[model samples]
Target: LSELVERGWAAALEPVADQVAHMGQFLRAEIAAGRRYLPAGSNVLRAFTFPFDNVRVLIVGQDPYPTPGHAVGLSFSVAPDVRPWPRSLANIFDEYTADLGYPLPSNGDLTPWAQRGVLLLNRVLTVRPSNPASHRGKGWEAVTECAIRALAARAAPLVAILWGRDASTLKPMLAAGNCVAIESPHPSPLSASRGFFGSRPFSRANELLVGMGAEPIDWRLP
Candidate 1:
C-alpha cells in the first residue's frame, strides 16, 4: 500500500490527503463536537483501489455496523462470534451466490476486492452511533461522486452501484458518457427486495468492464 502511494498509483489518504480530506476532517470534527452522528460502532469506511492508479468501479454503501467486533470495512460478514449476519445482507448474498453458482465466504474478508480493483467506500465517516441525519452524509456523497467522475474523466471507465436513496441520488450529477450509474433497492432486509440478487446488475456491469479490458472477479458471501 505504501509503495503504491509513493509511486502515485494510490494514496495513503491522510486527513489532509486528497481534495476530499477537508470534508472528512470536517465530519470527524462534527462527530467529536457532539453532533448526533451515527452510532460509532455500526459503520466502517474503507477503500480498495487499483494498483495502477486506474479505478474502474466504485461501491458506495450506507454505513458500517455499529461495532468494531462486526465492522470490517466491507459489508456484512458471517463470522459466528462477531454478530449474527444481518438478515438483509444474508439474503442478498444468498441470492447472489445462488445466481452465480458459487458458495458464500465465511468471514468478513475483502480479499476479492483488493484483487479485482474494486473500491469500497462508506458514506458516513464515523460509526459509533447511528446518525441518519448527519450533515456529513450529503457532503461525503457529493465528494465521492465528484471523485468518481474525475477518475472516469481520466479514461478510467467507471461503474457506480448506488444501493440506497442516498447513493442513487448521485445519478443525475454524473457526467454523461464518462460512467454508468445504476440505482437499486438497498440490500438490507429492511428494504423491500434484495436488489442485486438475480438482478444481473453487477454481472452486466462486470461484463462491460471486461469488454473495456478490466476483469472483475466474483464477490462471494462469507
Candidate 2:
C-alpha cells in the first residue's frame, strides 16, 4: 500500500495503514470487473505537486473529470492542452477575475497553484470514463476522508476552500485541524450565481493564510 501511495502522503496514512491496503484491494477488484478508471494522474499529481508538509491551502473537490484527458488529479483543473475547458472551471475563472481583478485565464491547467502549495484534492480519485459520478459508492471516499483527517492533524494552520456541498462535507474534519474553512456555492454554471460570484474566496484564502503567518498564494496563472 505504501508503494501504491504517494511519498508526500506516506506519513499521513500511517495511522490508517490497513485502510490503505483495503483501498488498493478495492481498486483492484473494481478493475477486474472490467471497468477502467481515471489514470492520467490519480492520487499522484497533488501530492507530487505540493508536498504534504508544505501544504498551506486545500481545495476540496468532489470527483475526477469524467472526460478523458481532462482530469489530472486536480479538481477544477484540466491538462494544459484541454481547449474548451470545463464549465465549473470556467465559472471559477470568472469568479477569479471578479475577485482579483485579473484577466480570466484561457488555460485550464492549474499546475502553478498546485506548485505554490494549493492541494487540489478530490473525494473520489477515479471515475468511469465519460461518466460523471460513476465512482460515488466506491471506497475512494473513505481513502479521501482519511486524507482529510490527516490534514486535520497538522499543527500549522492552513486554509480550506470548500466550493460545494460535496466539498463542504469535509467541514467537520477540516474544523478539527488547524484549518480555516471557506465555504461557498460551487462555481458551476448551474449554481455560480447563488453565492460564488462575489464570495472572493481566493482573496479570503490568502487573507487566512497571511493570518497564519504564511505567505499568501499567488492564484494568478502564468
Candidate 3:
C-alpha cells in the first residue's frame, strides 16, 4: 500500500492510517473467527492490480463480487472465461474504438493501463457481498472518500472516470480544476442501453492526454 502512495496514486497516507490498520485487524479477525466466505476454486488475488505510477487516467468501480468466481475487479465477469465484459464497459469499448477506428480488447487484463499509469480502483475495500448495505456502508464510504481525496491531492491535472452513481457522489469531495470527472449511468447490462450510449468520456480525456504528449492507448482494446 505504501507503494500506491509513493507512486502518487494515493494521497494523504496519514489520514487513512487508522483505516488501513483496521483492515489489517479485520483480515486477521476473520481468519481467527474461522469465517471463510471467499469463493471456492477462485484465486484470491484476481481482483486487483497496482498498475503504474505515471497513469494519467483513473477508473473507479463500485466493489468486487464478493465470491471469487466473479471478482475480476473490472465489475462484470461471467463464469469460466469472463468474456464480453459488462455492458457499460463493453459499450464504452465498442463506441470509443469505433470512433477511433480501432478494435479494443475486452478481457480482464489491465497491463495496458498499468504500463500507462491508469489506476483502476474499487470503491469499497472488500470485494464480496457486492453492494454496500447497512453492515459496511459507513466504513466503505469513509474509506472511499479517503481514497478519492488522496488520489486527487496526489494526481493533479489528471482525469478520473467515475463509473457509477456511487462514485459520482465523490465529486464534492474532490478538488476542483485538478481533476476531470464524467458521470454516466452504471455499466450493468440492465442500464446499458438507457445510460451508457453516447457516454464516451474517455475519448475527450484521452484527447487531452495526447495533446500533452502522454502515450494514449485504447483501454477497451488489449
Candidate 4:
C-alpha cells in the first residue's frame, strides 16, 4: 500500500494495516518469483486517494483489468491515453451517454469522478498480468471489505452503483447504511444488453443524491 493512503482513508484503513502489510509481503514474494502485476505497485491504492467522508458514490468492480497499461487502480478505468478502450469501459461510457443525453469526450480516464467523490474500487486490487481474478481469495478482500464497511457504517447519503454479480453481491453490506444501490448486469459485451446499457443508473444516482440533500456529481469527463 506504499505511503498512498490519503486523507481520512488513513484511519479508515488503519485497522487492516497488518493485513495490508502481509498482502504487500505476499505481492513482493510473488513478484520476486517472476509474477507481474497490473496497475504498477504505486497505483495499487489510487482509489483511496480522496477523503473517505467526502464519498457520495461507490462503484465496485471485481478486479483490475489484467492487461498491462489497462488498469490504473481505479476500477473500470484506464490511463487517459490508452487506445481502443476496454470493452467494459466503452460500455460504461455508452451507458453514461444514454443516461445523461450527452456523450463523454472519448476518454477512459475516470480520475475526475474519484476526485469528485466516486469511489472507483475493485474487490481484488491486484491481478497477475493476463490472468483475471488470479488474485482473488487473497488478502485484498479483507482490506477492501473494511473500506466498504467503513463507508456503509457512516450512515451518510451514498449511492452504490453495483454492476454485475460480483459487485451486486455487496448490496447486503450497504443495506444498513443510508445508501441507494443501483444494480445491473455487467457492462461486458456478453451482458451489457441484459440491463446494463439502459439502466440509467448515472442519472438515478444523482437524483437520489439530490433527494438526500447531497450535491450531485457532474458525471461529465473532461
Candidate 5:
C-alpha cells in the first residue's frame, strides 16, 4: 500500500504486495463473519510505521496477545493504559531489569523503543479473541518473511533478539546481513527459568550494536 511507501517499507513489502492484499481480504472476511482480531484496525501495521532503514534491533515474537487491548501491534507490547500486563511481558521486564539494571517500566507500551529503531514484530500479526495462534498459516508469514529477508540484506547494523524456539528460526535468515542474533528461551513463565531469566539480552544487544557503530537502544519506555 501507499502507506507502506510513505513509511519507508515500500521496497521490502513490494515483493509481497499480493500476499499482503490477500491476507487483508482474509482478515476482512474474518471480521465480517463476526470474528474479531486484536490490536484494532489501525494498529495492525503499526510495526511498519517505523521506517525500515532505521531498524537497529529486531525483537521477534510469535503472535499478538489474544486478549483484547493487550496487543498494540508491537511484539510483547500493549497500550500504555493497560494494567495487569501479560505474563510474558512481565517476565521480559524482569529480565530487562536484571540485564540492564534500569527501573522496571511501569507500562507495557514499547512504542518508545520502536521509535528508536526497534522492530518489535510478531510472526503472526493477528489473533482471534481468547484464541492464540488462530491466525497462523494465514499468509502473514509470507509478508513477514519478506520483511525479514529485506532487513537481512541491508548493509547497516541490526541486532535480532530472538526469544523462544519459533523466533530463533529467523537466525538463518538474518545470517546474510550485518546482523547479530541473540537467541534465548521465551520469557513466558513457562520457560523463563530455562535460560531466559539471566540471558541479559538487553545489555548484550547494546554491546553488539555499539560494536557495530550504531546507537545502543535506550530500552526504556516513556
Candidate 6:
C-alpha cells in the first residue's frame, strides 16, 4: 500500500520491503479480528530508520506487552502516559541506578534515549490485542531480521545490547564486525538477580560506544 511507503517505511524498511505487503495484510486481518498490535517504533518504520545512517546503539526486546497502553513500540519502554510501571522495567531501573547513581524516571518512557540514537527495537513487532506473543509464529521475525542485517551492512560501528535470549538470537546478524556486543541476562524480575542485577548494561554499552569513537548514550532516561 502507498501508506507504508509514505510512513518512511520504504527506505527504513528496505531490509524487508518485499514483505511489506504481506505484513500489511496480516495486520489488517488482525485489526479486523479485533486484535491490536504494536507497530515498529510507535508501530512501523522508526526502528532502524530513525538516523538513516548513524545508529550508534541497538537495544533489542522480545515483543510488546499484551496489556493496553503498556507497549509503546520501543523495546523496554512504556509510553509517557502508561501507568503502573512494568516489572522488567523496574529491574532495569535497579541496574540503572546502581550503575549510574540515579532512580528510575516517574514513567517508563525511553523516547529520550531513542532520540539520542539508541534503537530500542523488538524482535517481534506485533502481538494480539490482549495476547502477548500472539503474533510470534507469523512472519514478523523475517522482516525484523532483514532490518538487523541491513544494519549489519552499515559502514559505521554500533553498540548492541542483547538482554534476553530472544534478543540475543540477533547476535549473529549484529556481529557484522562493526558492533560492540554486550550480552546479559534478561532484566525481568525472575531473571535479574541471576546476572542482570549489577551488570550495568546501560553504562557498559556507553563505554563500548566511547571505545569505538562514538558518542556514548546518555542512559539517564529523564
Q: Write the per-residue lDDT of candidate 3 for residues 1-222, one digit (tens) a residue.
A: 453344333344457767756665665565577653332212322223343346577677776555444554433333446654545556656656655666666464554564556766666545334433212553545655665676676544567777777778878765566667767776666666666666776677787667655666565544
Taking all chains together, each candidate's TM-score versus the true structure is: 0.70, 0.90, 0.72, 0.96, 0.96, 0.89
Q: Which is the winner by lDDT between candidate 1 and candidate 4?
A: 4
Ranked candidates, highest lDDT first: 4, 5, 2, 6, 3, 1
The RMSD of every model to the true structure, in order and in angstroms, is 4.6, 2.1, 4.3, 1.4, 1.2, 2.5
The list of candidate 1 runs beyond 4 A from truth reads 1-45, 48-54, 75-81, 130-139, 192-196, 220-222
Consecutive 10-residue window with the lowest summed lDDT within model 2: 40-49
lDDT (0-100) at residue 111 of candidate 3?
A: 48
Give the CA lDDT, 0 to 100, for residue 94 in model 1.
68
* Tens-digit lDDT string for candidate 1 (1-222): 343132333333332245455555665686678753442322223343335354567676766555445555554432346546666557666666766776775754554664565666666544544433234544555544544555555656777777778788667655567677767877776763645556665576787677767766566534
Q: Which stretches of candidate 3 lie over 4 Å from their true place?
A: 1-12, 31-53, 72-92, 104-106, 129-138, 210-220
lDDT for each candidate structure: 0.56, 0.79, 0.56, 0.88, 0.87, 0.74
Q: Per-residue CA lDDT of candidate 5, range 1-222, in tens?
A: 666443568767889989878878987898899998887878877898888999999999989999998988899998899999899999999988888788889788898898899999898888998898899998899888888888888879989999999888888898864989999999988899999999999889999999999989888764
Superposed model 4: Cα runs more than 4 Å off:
none
Tens digits of per-residue lDDT for model 4 on 81-184?
89889888889999898889886656789988998999999998999999988999989999999999899888589999998888877888888748889999
Query: Poorest 10 consecutive residues of model 3 by lDDT?
Result: 39-48
Candidate 1 yields a Cα-based lDDT of 0.56
Candidate 6, residue 86: how far the Cα is off, in Å? 1.0
lDDT of 3 at 113: 60
Mind giving the per-residue lDDT tens digits that candidate 2 earns over 108-157? 99888877888888877778778887888766677778777877788877
Question: Which candidate would rank higher by TM-score, 2 or 4?
Answer: 4
Which pairs clash in model 2? none
Which is the winner by TM-score between candidate 4 and candidate 6? 4
